């Protein structure tokens, strides 16, 4: 248990031999390794290296692997220094996690020589020119599908005299090929369910098939199915990294949307009642019930102010002024949390 | 609301009955029509200028041509002949004025030789010291008779009261006739009879004061 006087550029740093002996793969825990640096003239190893970063490494030996970065040393020089002392790769990952970066993950691969060949072609698009081509085709089949949905409703517009059935069929044919190839060439049929984008593909392909069946074999129930056709805009989220951050932002902030709608509802039951009672006995617009004023308090608090219903007394007008300012405050109170979450996810890309 | 005197129509014929009013009444598009058999209440024939009230056939049609509202019965059937009124509001909705009517008449009922019934006064009616002579006319079409009384071969004219023709249950007509006579003049002559002529044919029923039962 003799004291060892390591010297880093003039700054002496004595520690007990056992404290370093506990870690034997490091530079100072491997005597055949550290011997080179040890100068025996004064019995003190001399390393001419950065001075204010040896304190961290000592704590790692002293506290059984607790590695923390001094906040007056940049990451590059601290990352380089753990390497010279050869604390070891397992140590580096602990440091990497402390910064909080996303340098952990790795994809699997089919590795069968053909399953690997189709999967590379479809899942990853920058890898080869045929692959860049497939994806560009897939943005068009979604854009020529959404154009068909809105046009059908225009007032002017299996007999196949309907071109909004031939064009839908080609679109519900390509989308189905992508779903099937992706399934057969997938490395795992367990993680196929995990991706939400595969579920988006299932939901945007179903209502064409149950419509087909009803004709091939709910009169206003059909309409519930007709709207569920609108979830083909969320097939854009594969070929866009600007939308996947919106996915991760709204999943990590569910509590601060519950708060936004809760705060907004309490006001709509608290300002509406005031204006109904204030404009009670006059030809007061439509304030004929507390339940009626709920439209007026949502339009004034969110600042849209359509102007359909407005107060017409003096008490109504003073309650309208307080309603407008209480809605700029109860809106702007939970939104800084959600804007901050987007900023962390957006820049962490780098 | 002005309507003419009479309209005569047959079985299977189309008669456009006019309601000539004004745009406070027919310009409402909520007029009313009615149907009145004598001896009954009026029954709602039409409402709304085209709408049909319950119990009314779709054949009746409220075609309108301006302020002269029409009624079109395609194929006039038997039970329709009655007094037909116009009705609406006037410059308000809780308000009303009717018309005074027109008679609609249907020809085509079963004609037959009349089943006439005569009743002589009762014995308690002779005890009550009066003599009414019942001469009834039934099962006859067209509804036209003249009411005569017959002493043994000579006419009796005075004291007559008769009713106009009225309808019966089984699609025919019915009538009656009363000769008001003193009991001293009933028990003075030996035989009394009721001559009734329907389309020229006279069916006789005879009674005497001296015949028991």
């Amino acid at each position: 248990g003799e004291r060892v006087v390591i010297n880093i550029s003039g700054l002496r740093f004595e520690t007990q031999l056992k404290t370093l002996c506990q870690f034997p793969e490091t530079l100072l825990g491997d005597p055949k390794r550290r011997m080179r640096y040890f100068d025996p003239l004064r019995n003190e190893y001399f390393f001419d290296r950065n001075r204010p970063s040896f304190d961290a490494i000592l704590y790692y030996y002293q506290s059984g692997g607790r590695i923390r970065r001094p906040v007056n040393v940049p990451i590059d020089i601290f990352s380089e220094e753990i390497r010279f002392y050869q604390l070891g790769e397992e140590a580096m990952e602990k440091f990497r996690e402390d910064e909080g970066f996303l340098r952990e993950e790795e994809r699997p691969l089919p590795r069968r020589d053909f399953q690997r060949q189709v999967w590379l072609l479809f899942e990853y698009p920058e890898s080869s020119g045929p692959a860049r081509g497939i994806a560009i085709v897939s943005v068009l089949v979604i854009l020529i599908s959404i154009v068909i949905f809105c046009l059908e409703t225009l007032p002017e517009f299996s007999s196949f005299s309907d071109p909004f059935f031939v064009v839908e069929t080609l679109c519900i044919i390509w989308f189905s090929f992508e779903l099937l190839v992706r399934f057969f060439a997938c490395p795992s049929k367990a993680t196929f369910s995990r991706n939400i984008m595969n579920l988006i593909d299932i939901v945007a392909i179903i209502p064409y098939f149950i419509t087909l069946g009803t004709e091939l074999a709910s009169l206003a129930i059909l309409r519930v199915i007709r709207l569920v056709r609108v979830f083909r805009i969320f097939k854009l989220s594969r070929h866009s990294k600007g939308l996947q951050i919106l996915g991760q932002t709204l999943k990590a902030s569910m509590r601060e949307l519950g708060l936004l709608i809760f705060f907004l509802f309490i006001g709509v039951i608290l300002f509406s009642s005031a204006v109904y009672f204030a404009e009670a006995d006059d030809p007061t617009s439509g304030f004929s019930s507390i339940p009626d004023a709920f439209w007026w308090a949502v339009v004034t608090m969110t600042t849209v102010g359509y102007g359909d219903m407005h107060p017409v007394t003096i008490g109504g007008k003073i309650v309208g002024s307080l309603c407008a300012i209480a809605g700029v405050l109860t809106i702007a109170l939970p939104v800084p949390v959600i804007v901050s979450n987007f900023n962390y996810f957006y820049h962490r890309e780098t | 609301l002005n309507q003419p005197s009479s309209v005569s129509g047959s079985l299977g014929q189309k008669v456009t009955i006019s309601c000539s009013g004004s745009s406070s009444n027919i310009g409402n598009n909520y007029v009313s029509w009615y149907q009145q058999l004598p001896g009954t209440a009026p029954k709602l024939l039409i409402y709304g200028d085209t709408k049909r009230p319950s119990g009314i056939p779709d054949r009746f049609s409220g075609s309108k041509s301006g302020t002269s509202a029409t009624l079109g019965i395609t194929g006039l059937q038997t039970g329709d002949e009655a007094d037909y009124y116009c009705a609406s509001a006037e410059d308000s909705s809780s308000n009303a004025v009717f018309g005074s009517g027109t008679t609609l008449t249907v020809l085509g009922q079963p004609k037959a030789a009349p089943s006439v019934t005569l009743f002589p006064p009762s014995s308690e009616e002779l005890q009550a010291n009066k003599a009414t002579l019942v001469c009834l006319i039934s099962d006859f079409y067209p509804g036209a008779v003249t009411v005569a009384w017959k002493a043994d071969s000579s006419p009796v004219k005075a004291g007559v009261e008769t009713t106009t023709p009225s309808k019966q249950s089984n699609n025919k007509y019915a009538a009656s006739s009363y000769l008001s006579l003193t009991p001293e003049q009933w028990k003075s002559h030996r035989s009394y009879s009721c001559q009734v002529t329907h389309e020229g044919s006279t069916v006789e029923k005879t009674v005497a004061p001296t015949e028991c039962s």
């Binding site: - | 909705s93 308000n95 004025v97 009414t132 009261e161 009713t163 009656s176």
Partner: protein
Amino acid sequence: QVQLREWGAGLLKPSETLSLTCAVYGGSFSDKYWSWIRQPPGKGLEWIGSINHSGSTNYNPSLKSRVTISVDTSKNQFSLKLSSVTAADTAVYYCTSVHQETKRSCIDTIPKSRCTAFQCKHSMKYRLSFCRKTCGTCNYEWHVDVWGQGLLVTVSSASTKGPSVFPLAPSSKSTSGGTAALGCLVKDYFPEPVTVSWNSGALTSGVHTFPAVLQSSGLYSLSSVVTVPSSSLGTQTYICNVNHKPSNTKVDKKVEPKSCD
């Protein structure tokens, strides 16, 4: 089904104010109004006046001053009143339930100069809120639903009497083969009309009732005839049940055949 039964004083005096009351069973819980409809014999239809469930009565513009109809939601019943009755006002009165819905409380909220062709056409806040009247986003009705049977109200100063009923049976000459006539005589009664039944409503084969005539003394006259098989002459009990509503009279005179006792 709204069942309407009229009850009141039917035989009144000159210069005495009228009163009927229609018993209304079957009140539908809708917007429908009750009134009365009068009709003299040989004279056309005429409205008298209404009342609604709110309290505003409406009458004929020829006749506003001579009606008073009252409401009661506790008995569910409607009434009638006429003043200054004379010989032209001899009428029968049908109580009636009428469907009466109306159509104008619009105002240009903003000054008229602002309301324009472009705005009304393209802006809905202008069209259905700010400028309803200048743009045009603001007519009557009258049709009955439920008629009534009628009650006769006639003005007179004379007195009312009951009927005198007599057995009227066929003779040995008046017989018409296998089917013979049979009936009753209602004579010297006032007023019109009186019904004569048979077997308390069990004999309807050949039922024939006749309208009554007027006399110079002040009484009315009718009789009846039913066609019965002549073998049953003396077998069944034939009872023509005269019921007189202004006098409360029921004379159950049983009709027996003829004999010479």
